[PDB]
Amino acid sequence: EVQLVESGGGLVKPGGSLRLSCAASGFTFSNAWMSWVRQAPGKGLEWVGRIKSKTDGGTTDYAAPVKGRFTISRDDSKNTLYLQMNSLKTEDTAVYYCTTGVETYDFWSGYDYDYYFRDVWGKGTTVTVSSASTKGPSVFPLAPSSGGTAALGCLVKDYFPEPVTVSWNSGALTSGVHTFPAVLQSSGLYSLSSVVTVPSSSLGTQTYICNVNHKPSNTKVDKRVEPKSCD
Amino acid sequence: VHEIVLTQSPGTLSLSPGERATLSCRASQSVSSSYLAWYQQKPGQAPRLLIYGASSRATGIPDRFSGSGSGTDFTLTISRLEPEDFAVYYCQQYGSSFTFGPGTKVDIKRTVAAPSVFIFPPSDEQLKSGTASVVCLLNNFYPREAKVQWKVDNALQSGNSQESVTEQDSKDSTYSLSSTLTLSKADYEKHKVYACEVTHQGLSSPVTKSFNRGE
Protein backbone atom coordinates (compact mmCIF):
# COMPACT_ATOMS: atom_id res chain seq x y z
CA GLU A 1 0.00 0.00 0.00
CA VAL A 2 2.42 2.65 -1.25
CA GLN A 3 1.42 6.22 -0.40
CA LEU A 4 2.79 9.77 -0.19
CA VAL A 5 0.99 12.54 1.70
CA GLU A 6 1.90 16.21 1.26
CA SER A 7 1.27 18.93 3.83
CA GLY A 8 2.25 22.49 4.65
CA GLY A 9 0.95 24.27 1.57
CA GLY A 10 -0.92 27.52 1.98
CA LEU A 11 -0.99 31.26 1.40
CA VAL A 12 2.30 33.15 1.81
CA LYS A 13 3.35 36.75 1.27
CA PRO A 14 6.15 37.34 -1.27
CA GLY A 15 9.53 37.01 0.42
CA GLY A 16 8.31 34.68 3.16
CA SER A 17 9.23 31.06 3.77
CA LEU A 18 7.25 27.83 3.78
CA ARG A 19 8.14 24.24 4.69
CA LEU A 20 6.43 21.44 2.77
CA SER A 21 6.41 17.96 4.29
CA CYS A 22 5.81 14.63 2.54
CA ALA A 23 5.10 11.52 4.63
CA ALA A 24 5.75 8.12 3.05
CA SER A 25 4.07 4.77 3.70
CA GLY A 26 4.06 1.27 2.28
CA PHE A 27 7.64 1.10 0.98
CA THR A 28 11.28 1.33 2.04
CA PHE A 29 11.68 5.10 2.17
CA SER A 30 15.37 5.04 3.11
CA ASN A 31 16.39 3.32 -0.15
CA ALA A 32 14.34 5.63 -2.41
CA TRP A 33 15.32 8.84 -4.17
CA MET A 34 12.73 11.56 -3.63
CA SER A 35 11.73 14.38 -5.98
CA TRP A 36 9.64 17.52 -5.67
CA VAL A 37 7.78 18.42 -8.88
CA ARG A 38 5.55 21.49 -9.11
CA GLN A 39 2.81 22.51 -11.54
CA ALA A 40 1.65 26.10 -11.95
CA PRO A 41 -2.04 26.84 -12.63
CA GLY A 42 -2.87 25.67 -16.15
CA LYS A 43 0.81 25.23 -17.06
CA GLY A 44 3.03 22.20 -17.60
CA LEU A 45 4.91 20.13 -15.05
CA GLU A 46 8.17 21.51 -13.67
CA TRP A 47 10.81 19.50 -11.83
CA VAL A 48 11.82 21.32 -8.64
CA GLY A 49 14.47 19.02 -7.23
CA ARG A 50 15.59 15.62 -6.03
CA ILE A 51 17.51 14.13 -3.10
CA LYS A 52 19.24 10.75 -3.27
CA SER A 53 19.38 7.82 -0.88
CA LYS A 54 21.81 7.67 2.02
CA THR A 55 23.62 4.87 0.18
CA ASP A 56 24.11 7.10 -2.88
CA GLY A 57 25.41 10.03 -0.80
CA GLY A 58 22.13 11.87 -0.31
CA THR A 59 23.20 14.79 -2.49
CA THR A 60 20.62 17.18 -3.93
CA ASP A 61 19.91 18.51 -7.42
CA TYR A 62 17.85 21.68 -7.84
CA ALA A 63 16.15 23.33 -10.78
CA ALA A 64 17.54 26.64 -12.02
CA PRO A 65 14.65 28.98 -11.00
CA VAL A 66 14.73 27.59 -7.43
CA LYS A 67 18.44 26.86 -7.03
CA GLY A 68 19.50 29.39 -4.40
CA ARG A 69 16.12 29.63 -2.66
CA PHE A 70 14.70 26.11 -2.21
CA THR A 71 16.34 23.35 -0.17
CA ILE A 72 15.41 19.65 -0.10
CA SER A 73 16.09 17.54 2.99
CA ARG A 74 14.95 14.18 4.35
CA ASP A 75 14.25 12.61 7.74
CA ASP A 76 14.62 8.83 7.51
CA SER A 77 13.54 8.05 11.08
CA LYS A 78 9.96 9.17 10.37
CA ASN A 79 9.99 8.65 6.56
CA THR A 80 9.56 12.32 5.70
CA LEU A 81 10.77 14.55 2.86
CA TYR A 82 11.05 18.31 3.32
CA LEU A 83 11.04 21.19 0.83
CA GLN A 84 12.13 24.42 2.50
CA MET A 85 11.11 27.41 0.36
CA ASN A 86 12.70 30.79 1.06
CA SER A 87 12.36 34.16 -0.67
CA LEU A 88 9.11 33.11 -2.30
CA LYS A 89 8.13 34.77 -5.58
CA THR A 90 4.71 35.05 -7.21
CA GLU A 91 5.66 32.55 -9.93
CA ASP A 92 6.19 29.91 -7.21
CA THR A 93 2.40 29.56 -6.87
CA ALA A 94 1.76 25.94 -7.83
CA VAL A 95 0.64 22.49 -6.74
CA TYR A 96 3.65 20.61 -5.37
CA TYR A 97 3.93 16.82 -5.61
CA CYS A 98 6.45 14.51 -4.00
CA THR A 99 7.34 11.34 -5.86
CA THR A 100 9.81 8.49 -5.87
CA GLY A 101 10.38 9.30 -9.53
CA VAL A 102 11.80 7.56 -12.56
CA GLU A 103 15.29 7.35 -11.08
CA THR A 104 13.90 5.37 -8.14
CA TYR A 105 11.68 3.20 -10.35
CA ASP A 106 14.51 2.51 -12.83
CA PHE A 107 17.33 1.81 -10.36
CA TRP A 108 14.97 -0.51 -8.44
CA SER A 109 15.10 -2.90 -11.44
CA GLY A 110 11.41 -2.56 -12.23
CA TYR A 111 9.63 -3.85 -9.12
CA ASP A 112 11.25 -5.12 -5.93
CA TYR A 113 13.21 -6.00 0.74
CA ASP A 114 9.52 -6.82 1.37
CA TYR A 115 7.94 -7.87 -1.95
CA TYR A 116 7.41 -5.34 -4.75
CA PHE A 117 7.52 -1.64 -5.64
CA ARG A 118 5.50 0.74 -7.79
CA ASP A 119 5.85 4.37 -8.83
CA VAL A 120 4.08 6.50 -6.22
CA TRP A 121 2.89 10.12 -6.27
CA GLY A 122 1.27 12.30 -3.65
CA LYS A 123 -2.04 14.10 -3.93
CA GLY A 124 -0.11 17.38 -3.94
CA THR A 125 -0.29 20.49 -1.78
CA THR A 126 -1.14 23.95 -3.10
CA VAL A 127 1.23 26.84 -2.39
CA THR A 128 -0.07 30.34 -3.15
CA VAL A 129 2.32 33.30 -3.09
CA SER A 130 0.41 36.58 -3.05
CA SER A 131 0.35 39.79 -1.01
CA ALA A 132 -3.39 40.19 -1.66
CA SER A 133 -5.97 40.20 1.12
CA THR A 134 -9.15 38.17 1.40
CA LYS A 135 -11.96 39.77 -0.60
CA GLY A 136 -15.41 38.65 -1.69
CA PRO A 137 -16.36 38.96 -5.35
CA SER A 138 -18.80 41.22 -7.12
CA VAL A 139 -21.31 39.38 -9.31
CA PHE A 140 -22.48 41.08 -12.50
CA PRO A 141 -25.00 39.88 -15.10
CA LEU A 142 -24.15 38.98 -18.69
CA ALA A 143 -27.60 39.69 -20.14
CA PRO A 144 -28.54 38.61 -23.69
CA SER A 145 -30.41 40.53 -26.39
CA SER A 146 -32.34 37.05 -30.18
CA GLY A 147 -32.66 33.97 -32.38
CA GLY A 148 -33.30 30.45 -31.13
CA THR A 149 -30.42 29.90 -28.71
CA ALA A 150 -29.81 32.65 -26.15
CA ALA A 151 -26.81 32.87 -23.83
CA LEU A 152 -26.82 34.45 -20.37
CA GLY A 153 -24.18 34.43 -17.66
CA CYS A 154 -22.53 35.62 -14.45
CA LEU A 155 -19.23 37.48 -14.13
CA VAL A 156 -17.71 36.82 -10.69
CA LYS A 157 -15.00 39.47 -10.42
CA ASP A 158 -12.34 40.63 -7.98
CA TYR A 159 -12.15 37.93 -5.31
CA PHE A 160 -9.32 36.36 -3.32
CA PRO A 161 -8.34 33.71 -2.65
CA GLU A 162 -9.57 30.76 -4.69
CA PRO A 163 -11.97 29.05 -5.14
CA VAL A 164 -15.50 30.15 -6.03
CA THR A 165 -18.41 27.79 -6.67
CA VAL A 166 -21.09 28.75 -9.21
CA SER A 167 -24.31 26.79 -9.70
CA TRP A 168 -27.54 27.65 -11.51
CA ASN A 169 -31.07 27.67 -10.04
CA SER A 170 -29.86 26.11 -6.77
CA GLY A 171 -28.19 23.38 -8.83
CA ALA A 172 -31.30 22.38 -10.81
CA LEU A 173 -29.86 23.59 -14.14
CA THR A 174 -26.82 21.76 -15.54
CA SER A 175 -27.53 21.28 -19.24
CA GLY A 176 -25.63 23.77 -21.38
CA VAL A 177 -23.69 25.30 -18.46
CA HIS A 178 -20.06 26.28 -19.07
CA THR A 179 -18.10 27.57 -16.08
CA PHE A 180 -14.70 28.82 -17.16
CA PRO A 181 -11.44 28.54 -15.19
CA ALA A 182 -10.63 31.60 -13.11
CA VAL A 183 -8.13 34.17 -14.36
CA LEU A 184 -5.62 35.96 -12.14
CA GLN A 185 -5.72 39.65 -12.99
CA SER A 186 -2.71 41.95 -12.69
CA SER A 187 -4.46 43.50 -9.67
CA GLY A 188 -3.84 40.23 -7.80
CA LEU A 189 -7.53 39.26 -7.68
CA TYR A 190 -9.34 36.48 -9.53
CA SER A 191 -12.11 36.67 -12.12
CA LEU A 192 -14.45 33.93 -13.30
CA SER A 193 -17.28 33.55 -15.81
CA SER A 194 -20.21 31.11 -15.91
CA VAL A 195 -22.49 31.06 -18.97
CA VAL A 196 -25.61 29.10 -19.93
CA THR A 197 -27.33 28.56 -23.27
CA VAL A 198 -31.09 28.12 -23.43
CA PRO A 199 -33.95 28.33 -25.97
CA SER A 200 -35.21 31.90 -26.24
CA SER A 201 -38.86 30.83 -25.93
CA SER A 202 -38.26 30.06 -22.23
CA LEU A 203 -36.90 33.51 -21.31
CA GLY A 204 -40.33 34.67 -20.14
CA THR A 205 -41.42 31.31 -18.73
CA GLN A 206 -38.43 30.28 -16.59
CA THR A 207 -36.20 32.33 -14.29
CA TYR A 208 -32.42 31.97 -14.13
CA ILE A 209 -30.42 32.72 -10.98
CA CYS A 210 -26.72 31.99 -10.60
CA ASN A 211 -25.65 31.05 -7.07
CA VAL A 212 -22.09 32.13 -6.25
CA ASN A 213 -20.31 30.98 -3.09
CA HIS A 214 -16.92 32.27 -1.91
CA LYS A 215 -16.31 30.54 1.43
CA PRO A 216 -12.93 32.17 2.26
CA SER A 217 -14.79 35.46 2.86
CA ASN A 218 -18.16 33.87 3.79
CA THR A 219 -19.93 35.35 0.77
CA LYS A 220 -23.11 33.96 -0.79
CA VAL A 221 -24.82 35.74 -3.70
CA ASP A 222 -27.86 34.84 -5.82
CA LYS A 223 -27.93 36.93 -9.01
CA ARG A 224 -30.99 36.81 -11.27
CA VAL A 225 -30.05 37.19 -14.95
CA GLU A 226 -32.53 38.19 -17.65
CA PRO A 227 -32.41 40.08 -20.97
CA LYS A 228 -31.55 43.75 -20.52
CA SER A 229 -34.66 45.91 -20.26
CA CYS A 230 -34.74 48.18 -23.31
CA ASP A 231 -36.50 50.80 -21.15
CA VAL B 1 28.32 18.59 -18.63
CA HIS B 2 25.79 21.34 -19.30
CA GLU B 3 22.02 21.71 -19.01
CA ILE B 4 19.92 20.28 -21.86
CA VAL B 5 16.74 21.84 -23.22
CA LEU B 6 13.86 19.58 -24.21
CA THR B 7 11.30 20.10 -27.00
CA GLN B 8 8.14 18.00 -27.41
CA SER B 9 6.85 18.09 -31.00
CA PRO B 10 4.07 18.61 -31.80
CA GLY B 11 1.99 20.75 -29.43
CA THR B 12 -1.39 19.07 -29.91
CA LEU B 13 -2.52 15.84 -31.56
CA SER B 14 -6.14 15.61 -32.70
CA LEU B 15 -7.19 11.98 -32.56
CA SER B 16 -10.15 9.60 -32.48
CA PRO B 17 -10.64 6.34 -30.53
CA GLY B 18 -9.04 3.29 -32.11
CA GLU B 19 -6.37 5.30 -33.94
CA ARG B 20 -2.57 5.13 -33.55
CA ALA B 21 -0.94 7.93 -31.55
CA THR B 22 2.68 8.94 -32.19
CA LEU B 23 4.20 11.58 -29.88
CA SER B 24 7.71 12.90 -30.45
CA CYS B 25 10.19 14.18 -27.86
CA ARG B 26 13.30 16.03 -29.06
CA ALA B 27 16.33 17.16 -27.07
CA SER B 28 19.12 19.71 -27.24
CA GLN B 29 21.93 17.15 -26.82
CA SER B 30 22.35 13.42 -26.23
CA VAL B 31 20.35 12.03 -23.31
CA SER B 32 22.74 10.09 -21.09
CA SER B 33 22.18 6.31 -21.27
CA SER B 34 18.81 6.97 -22.97
CA TYR B 35 17.37 8.09 -19.62
CA LEU B 36 14.07 9.44 -20.92
CA ALA B 37 10.64 8.82 -19.40
CA TRP B 38 7.00 9.21 -20.42
CA TYR B 39 4.26 10.25 -17.97
CA GLN B 40 0.51 10.62 -18.52
CA GLN B 41 -1.56 13.25 -16.69
CA LYS B 42 -5.38 13.57 -16.66
CA PRO B 43 -6.79 16.77 -15.13
CA GLY B 44 -7.20 16.87 -11.37
CA GLN B 45 -4.78 13.94 -10.99
CA ALA B 46 -1.10 13.37 -10.43
CA PRO B 47 0.97 12.05 -13.35
CA ARG B 48 1.23 8.33 -14.08
CA LEU B 49 4.54 6.82 -15.14
CA LEU B 50 4.24 5.00 -18.47
CA ILE B 51 7.77 4.53 -19.86
CA TYR B 52 11.25 4.63 -18.33
CA GLY B 53 14.57 4.26 -20.10
CA ALA B 54 13.35 5.11 -23.61
CA SER B 55 11.58 1.80 -24.27
CA SER B 56 10.87 -0.01 -20.96
CA ARG B 57 7.32 0.28 -19.63
CA ALA B 58 6.17 -0.01 -16.03
CA THR B 59 4.24 -2.69 -14.16
CA GLY B 60 0.54 -2.54 -15.04
CA ILE B 61 0.79 -0.30 -18.12
CA PRO B 62 -1.26 -1.93 -20.92
CA ASP B 63 0.59 -3.34 -23.91
CA ARG B 64 -0.73 -0.66 -26.29
CA PHE B 65 1.86 1.76 -24.85
CA SER B 66 5.41 1.57 -26.18
CA GLY B 67 8.47 3.77 -26.44
CA SER B 68 11.53 4.05 -28.63
CA GLY B 69 14.33 6.39 -29.66
CA SER B 70 17.80 7.33 -28.49
CA GLY B 71 20.41 10.09 -28.54
CA THR B 72 18.38 13.20 -29.33
CA ASP B 73 14.99 11.88 -30.51
CA PHE B 74 12.42 9.73 -28.70
CA THR B 75 8.93 8.49 -29.47
CA LEU B 76 5.86 7.33 -27.56
CA THR B 77 3.37 5.13 -29.42
CA ILE B 78 -0.19 4.07 -28.61
CA SER B 79 -1.56 1.31 -30.86
CA ARG B 80 -5.31 1.49 -30.11
CA LEU B 81 -6.58 4.32 -27.91
CA GLU B 82 -9.20 3.55 -25.27
CA PRO B 83 -11.71 6.12 -23.97
CA GLU B 84 -9.38 6.70 -21.00
CA ASP B 85 -6.18 7.42 -22.97
CA PHE B 86 -7.13 11.04 -23.79
CA ALA B 87 -4.81 13.10 -21.58
CA VAL B 88 -1.59 15.15 -21.56
CA TYR B 89 1.74 13.38 -22.06
CA TYR B 90 5.11 14.58 -20.76
CA CYS B 91 8.63 13.33 -21.35
CA GLN B 92 11.34 13.86 -18.73
CA GLN B 93 15.10 13.42 -18.94
CA TYR B 94 17.17 12.18 -16.01
CA GLY B 95 20.63 11.51 -17.42
CA SER B 96 22.55 14.75 -16.91
CA SER B 97 19.60 17.18 -16.85
CA PHE B 98 16.21 16.55 -15.24
CA THR B 99 13.76 18.82 -17.06
CA PHE B 100 10.25 17.95 -18.22
CA GLY B 101 8.85 18.42 -21.70
CA PRO B 102 6.38 21.16 -22.61
CA GLY B 103 3.62 18.54 -22.89
CA THR B 104 1.27 17.28 -25.57
CA LYS B 105 -2.52 17.03 -25.29
CA VAL B 106 -4.46 14.20 -26.93
CA ASP B 107 -8.06 15.35 -27.37
CA ILE B 108 -11.05 13.61 -28.93
CA LYS B 109 -11.71 14.14 -32.63
CA ARG B 110 -15.04 15.26 -34.06
CA THR B 111 -16.49 17.13 -37.01
CA VAL B 112 -15.53 20.79 -37.31
CA ALA B 113 -18.03 22.90 -35.36
CA ALA B 114 -18.22 26.67 -35.68
CA PRO B 115 -18.47 28.69 -32.46
CA SER B 116 -21.57 30.61 -31.46
CA VAL B 117 -20.47 34.19 -30.76
CA PHE B 118 -22.20 36.37 -28.17
CA ILE B 119 -21.23 39.78 -26.78
CA PHE B 120 -22.17 41.21 -23.37
CA PRO B 121 -21.69 44.88 -22.44
CA PRO B 122 -20.81 45.93 -18.88
CA SER B 123 -23.66 46.11 -16.41
CA ASP B 124 -24.66 49.44 -14.91
CA GLU B 125 -23.68 48.22 -11.44
CA GLN B 126 -20.11 47.55 -12.58
CA LEU B 127 -19.99 50.97 -14.24
CA LYS B 128 -21.06 52.44 -10.90
CA SER B 129 -18.11 50.56 -9.41
CA GLY B 130 -15.73 52.31 -11.82
CA THR B 131 -14.67 49.61 -14.32
CA ALA B 132 -16.18 48.14 -17.50
CA SER B 133 -15.91 44.49 -18.53
CA VAL B 134 -17.09 43.46 -22.00
CA VAL B 135 -17.44 39.71 -22.58
CA CYS B 136 -17.16 37.80 -25.86
CA LEU B 137 -18.38 34.20 -25.65
CA LEU B 138 -17.46 31.55 -28.23
CA ASN B 139 -19.58 28.48 -27.56
CA ASN B 140 -19.45 24.82 -28.61
CA PHE B 141 -16.74 24.83 -31.28
CA TYR B 142 -14.07 22.44 -32.57
CA PRO B 143 -11.14 22.40 -33.23
CA ARG B 144 -9.48 24.29 -30.39
CA GLU B 145 -7.67 26.99 -32.38
CA ALA B 146 -9.60 30.27 -32.34
CA LYS B 147 -8.73 33.96 -32.59
CA VAL B 148 -10.63 36.73 -30.78
CA GLN B 149 -9.89 40.34 -31.75
CA TRP B 150 -11.35 43.30 -29.86
CA LYS B 151 -12.25 46.49 -31.75
CA VAL B 152 -13.22 49.72 -29.99
CA ASP B 153 -14.27 52.33 -32.57
CA ASN B 154 -12.20 50.23 -35.01
CA ALA B 155 -9.11 50.49 -32.78
CA LEU B 156 -7.53 47.07 -32.30
CA GLN B 157 -7.27 46.40 -28.57
CA SER B 158 -4.13 44.68 -27.30
CA GLY B 159 -3.03 43.87 -23.76
CA ASN B 160 -6.31 44.59 -21.92
CA SER B 161 -8.14 41.28 -22.48
CA GLN B 162 -7.92 37.76 -21.07
CA GLU B 163 -9.21 34.39 -22.26
CA SER B 164 -10.43 31.24 -20.50
CA VAL B 165 -11.11 27.91 -22.21
CA THR B 166 -13.04 24.93 -20.88
CA GLU B 167 -11.94 21.35 -21.23
CA GLN B 168 -13.54 19.21 -23.92
CA ASP B 169 -17.23 18.86 -23.12
CA SER B 170 -17.93 15.25 -22.18
CA LYS B 171 -21.10 15.05 -24.31
CA ASP B 172 -20.33 16.88 -27.58
CA SER B 173 -16.50 17.01 -27.33
CA THR B 174 -16.52 20.73 -28.16
CA TYR B 175 -14.79 23.75 -26.62
CA SER B 176 -15.93 27.06 -25.17
CA LEU B 177 -13.89 30.25 -24.86
CA SER B 178 -14.61 33.37 -22.81
CA SER B 179 -12.73 36.60 -23.57
CA THR B 180 -12.95 39.59 -21.22
CA LEU B 181 -11.96 43.11 -22.27
CA THR B 182 -11.39 45.40 -19.27
CA LEU B 183 -11.49 49.19 -19.52
CA SER B 184 -11.86 52.07 -17.12
CA LYS B 185 -15.25 53.76 -16.90
CA ALA B 186 -13.70 56.93 -18.32
CA ASP B 187 -12.16 55.10 -21.28
CA TYR B 188 -15.37 53.12 -21.76
CA GLU B 189 -17.52 56.26 -21.95
CA LYS B 190 -15.23 57.84 -24.58
CA HIS B 191 -16.13 55.28 -27.26
CA LYS B 192 -19.30 53.99 -28.91
CA VAL B 193 -18.92 50.77 -30.93
CA TYR B 194 -17.54 47.68 -29.16
CA ALA B 195 -16.94 44.54 -31.20
CA CYS B 196 -15.22 41.17 -31.09
CA GLU B 197 -14.22 39.52 -34.36
CA VAL B 198 -13.80 35.74 -34.25
CA THR B 199 -11.62 33.73 -36.64
CA HIS B 200 -12.10 29.96 -36.65
CA GLN B 201 -11.74 27.09 -39.11
CA GLY B 202 -15.49 26.47 -39.27
CA LEU B 203 -16.18 30.00 -40.54
CA SER B 204 -16.05 31.15 -44.15
CA SER B 205 -15.09 34.66 -42.99
CA PRO B 206 -14.39 36.14 -39.54
CA VAL B 207 -17.62 36.85 -37.67
CA THR B 208 -17.99 40.18 -35.85
CA LYS B 209 -20.37 40.70 -32.93
CA SER B 210 -20.84 44.27 -31.74
CA PHE B 211 -22.94 46.70 -29.75
CA ASN B 212 -23.23 50.47 -29.38
CA ARG B 213 -22.67 51.87 -25.90
CA GLY B 214 -25.95 52.82 -24.25
CA GLU B 215 -28.38 51.18 -26.68
Author numbering:
A (entry chain H): 1 to 52, 52A, 52B, 52C, 53 to 82, 82A, 82B, 82C, ...
B (entry chain L): -1 to 27, 27A, 28 to 94, 96 to 213
Study text:
Broadly neutralizing antibodies (bnAbs) to the HIV envelope (Env) V2-apex region are important leads for HIV vaccine design. Most V2-apex bnAbs engage Env with an uncommonly long heavy-chain complementarity-determining region 3 (HCDR3), suggesting that the rarity of bnAb precursors poses a challenge for vaccine priming. HCDR3s for these bnAbs mediate binding by reaching through the conserved glycan shield to contact a positively charged, semi-conserved protein surface on strand C of the V2 loop (Andrabi et al., 2015, 2017; Gorman et al., 2016; Landais et al., 2017; Lee et al., 2017; McLellan et al., 2011; Pancera et al., 2010, 2013; Pejchal et al., 2010; Sok et al., 2014). We then engineered ApexGT Env trimers that bound inferred germlines for PCT64 and PG9 and had higher affinities for bnAbs, determined cryo-EM structures of ApexGT trimers complexed with inferred-germline and bnAb forms of PCT64 and PG9, and developed an mRNA-encoded cell-surface ApexGT trimer.
In the previously reported apo crystal structure of a PCT64 LMCA variant (with three light-chain mutations that confer neutralization to autologous viruses), the HCDR3 formed a collapsed coil (Rantalainen et al., 2018). Here, we solved the apo crystal structure of the true LMCA Fab and found a similar collapsed coil/disordered HCDR3 conformation. In our PCT64 LMCA complex structure, the HCDR3 adopted a beta-hairpin conformation resembling more mature PCT64 antibodies (e.g., PCT64 13C), which suggested that either the apo coil conformation was a crystallization artifact or that PCT64 LMCA binds via an induced-fit mechanism.
